[PDB]
Design a protein around this nucleic acid. Sequence first.
DNA 1: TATAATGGGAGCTGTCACGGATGCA
DNA 2: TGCATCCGTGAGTGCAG
Lengths: 90, 96, 98, 49, 243, 346, 144
Amino acid sequence: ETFPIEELVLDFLEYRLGEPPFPQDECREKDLTYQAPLYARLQLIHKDTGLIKEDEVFLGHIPLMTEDGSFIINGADRVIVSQIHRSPGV
Amino acid sequence: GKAQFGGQRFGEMEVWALEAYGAAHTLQEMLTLKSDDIEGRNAAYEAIIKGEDVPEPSVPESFRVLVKELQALALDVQTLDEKDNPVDIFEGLASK
Amino acid sequence: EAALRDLDEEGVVRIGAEVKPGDILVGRTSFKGESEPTPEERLLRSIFGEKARDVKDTSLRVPPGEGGIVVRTVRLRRGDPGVELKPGVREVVRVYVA
Amino acid sequence: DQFRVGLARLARGVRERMLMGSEDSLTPAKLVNSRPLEAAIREFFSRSQ
Amino acid sequence: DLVRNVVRVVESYDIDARMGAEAIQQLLKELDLEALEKELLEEMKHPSRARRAKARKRLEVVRAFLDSGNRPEWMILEAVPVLPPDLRPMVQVDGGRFATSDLNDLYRRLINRNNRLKKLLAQGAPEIIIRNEKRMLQEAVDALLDNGRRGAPVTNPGSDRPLRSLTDILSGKQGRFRQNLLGKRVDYSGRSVIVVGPQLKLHQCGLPKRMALELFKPFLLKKMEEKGIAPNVKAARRMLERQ
Amino acid sequence: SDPVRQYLHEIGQVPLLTLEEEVELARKVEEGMEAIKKLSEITGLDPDLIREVVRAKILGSARVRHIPGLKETLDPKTVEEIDQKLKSLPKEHKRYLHIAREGEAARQHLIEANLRLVVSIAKKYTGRGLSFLDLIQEGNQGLIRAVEKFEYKRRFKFSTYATWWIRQAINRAIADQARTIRIPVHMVETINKLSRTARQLQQELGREPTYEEIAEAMGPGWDAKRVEETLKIAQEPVSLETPIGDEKDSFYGDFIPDEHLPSPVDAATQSLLSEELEKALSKLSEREAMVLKLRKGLIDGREHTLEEVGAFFGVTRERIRQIENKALRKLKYHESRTRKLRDFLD
Amino acid sequence: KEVRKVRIALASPEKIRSWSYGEVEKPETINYRTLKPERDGLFDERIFGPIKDYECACGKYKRQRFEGKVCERCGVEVTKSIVKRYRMGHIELATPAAHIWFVKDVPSKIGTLLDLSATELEQVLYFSKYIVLDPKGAILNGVP
DNA sequence: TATAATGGGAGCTGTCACGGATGCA
DNA sequence: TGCATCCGTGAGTGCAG
Ligand SMILES: [Zn+2]
């Protein structure tokens, strides 16, 4: 949806997710978050010449959900309560 | 709150209660020496550990905040005696 | 010392003690302020042969109506491996009670 | 949803540096400030209702 | 003109036509209150009852000022007051970090604009600019006093929380009246779970003894001397501080 | 109704200049400055003092204030008074009154004529601690700088030179008012230098850097200790009304105890000291518990070493430092029966 | 004497000044290094009060006997820190400004007292229209 | 301190009921 | 003149939080 960015133009190839720098329990202790690093490969292209560069820039950490349905966020388990709302339509 | 080592909130509705009983001195107590009448509060606890009856109270501190907060809105609130001349509830500490 | 008979060299209760309200769980010292001993106080010490001390008891005691049996302790300094805490904090000690 | 709002903020941050600072010596690496994304995610999980 | 060696005159008047609180402090200042009373009643005589109605509403406000001694102009501050620091503090919380009232960030907000206008004056800037500084000046003072009342509300950055303005403090269930004047928190009080005691007489209750101690702690320190489970009251307290 | 769209309208009013009108107005200003010091070496009054008087009449009396830095309080009497010994001049000298007045008026229409530009610069500086408008004024503020320091003779379009002073004053205000605790601009300057170089470190690491990994990429004179204490002042304060919970009937400031004002345990304690110590002065002697009662103070303290102790005690200098010792000495055996002072060391 | 009533009324500009102990000139709080209050800003002690009971700001005078001397070096009274709670400051505005209560509290108290429409008072105040005070004979589209 | 650059940007949504002040056939 | 129509104001207690 957000890509590609427009006038030079910057387009989206693919994302990847890496395994977490610390295992579930290690984050519970060290008041960390149980999250995975988010990389996204991009290609810049020049609106006038034909420029081509392509790095996979690091976007941060996306937190991961454990086996039972919970999350760990600064080392406390949490739940994301589904929300009810009027639905789209006419 | 228990964890702060709280006080019990004695609310509008509790004040009504005491009001309906007519316990003026018990209510006043709640509203000065037991809450924020810094002067008579300190004065009281000294009175208990000294085995004396607690002392009649002065103006709650939170009322002073109510005065100063109405000045900051440019309103001139004024305590007055029966002959209509002001009364300093700040004991001169905010006059020049 | 009775008031410390359960603390290790560093200032931690020993794992397996019994702790009750009032008891120190982790001794700690912070420095006194610009109210460093005022006259009233500089004199009271003048009689007792100890001069004003420069640090303060900020020990973590136990809250009213709490307590039990120290089951674990966690001590995280900085200068130790794997560990780095929010800026300006030397060391953070946690003691789990049961 | 919260992700689609971090992404759109990052896109206010590329085009800003797509039209001020040098329109040819530029990579993806240095046209992307990860922070508008990192923050909307930190938000969703730490202060949502 | 020195090139055409003509002296040009452009058709335009010395009119006095202003904008903002600067204007109104004048119009309010030029109000002979007694006069307007005279006219409003001298018009309270009218029929149709609709003119008679609003010359009452208006007249009420005149006599409000007449009877009290306030000057209408006074509803326009030149000198905005500042509230003592301690009532809007800057404090270091445990982590050596600082917590501060919303008012400072509202004052600062206003002090910048008054300052940057005091400059824009001396550096002689166009109206179109000095105008914008003055406007921005009301909205400053209008948010210090009653943020959000008019226009958008003043939000610190990165949040959508309206700042807490002077009126917001004064008013509401959370305001100064209903939350600190018509009932406070209190010392010498406790809470606990209740439990039926059918052995009590009508006039009695079961107060656990740990609560009892505290709620009477002063009294217990003094008694603790009058018998002597401690020499003086200060040592008396240090006894009961660990169980 | 919306305070931006409004200013955006007042601006859409003064039309954009054209290259001629650029140079015409630019031109008329430079001459009028020259005209002022030429017009001050004829009269010797003062460059600024004069320029303000040229400014007064051109803009109208709508405004006037004693401009700090000029030595007379510029009340419209000294403007008529000085517009007079000015307009008193010979057509070949009072030639330059006409020159200043015309130039001041070009100043105005050149500022007003280039306000749109500031808009489209401060537009890019939002979300930084300063309101759009606030950035605009700061922007315009510089724009004023740009006219008084332009040189049309260099053949530049006015845009090019002003687009420097504009973004010089935005960036200065973005760095001098944004924070509740103001920090020197050069300290701000280097803070962002961490923020930026840490950010690339993270973008190269797949994780946030440590203190150390920062002091390295930060270079020399940078250790792990000094990146730490730099952050701990970067730290913005937090609101006392920061909302607690997800209803809102609690405020993060309420959970904060006031430790300045003395508690009632406390302020009671001080009274049973400062009197149960007066309970050990007049118990063994009250004039040797007065010369030592002025070796300190019952309030204010009285303690230096040897100089007022030698002035008015009754006795000689190193003789009060002896009944100072027998003062204390009497009190250490005094308080071996009334042992009710130990408890005050806690 | 003993309180018996409580009066509320408008504070004149000169009266606001009456209360004040100093123009808060700077938008500064407290020094990012000494964590002490910048002078002439929102927490300055030469305005509001000593921060420590009967202790002057810089060191000058530090106990009860000197009670009320504004030390010369730093300029801070020698009284109880409790006055930081009561001593008003004042900001001294460049161009006068309206108190929004007396504007936007319908029906307006400035807007009825001058037969000024609701929406007129806005325009004239938030700068969307001029308001003629002496037209010096001006005339517009054939009407003085 | 100097190529030139000259009008923004996010709105937010499903309550209610009353009283007062303003607009309009 | 009578009556739409808008704007601003309210919307329970304490405790855990
Ligand atoms: Zn001093």
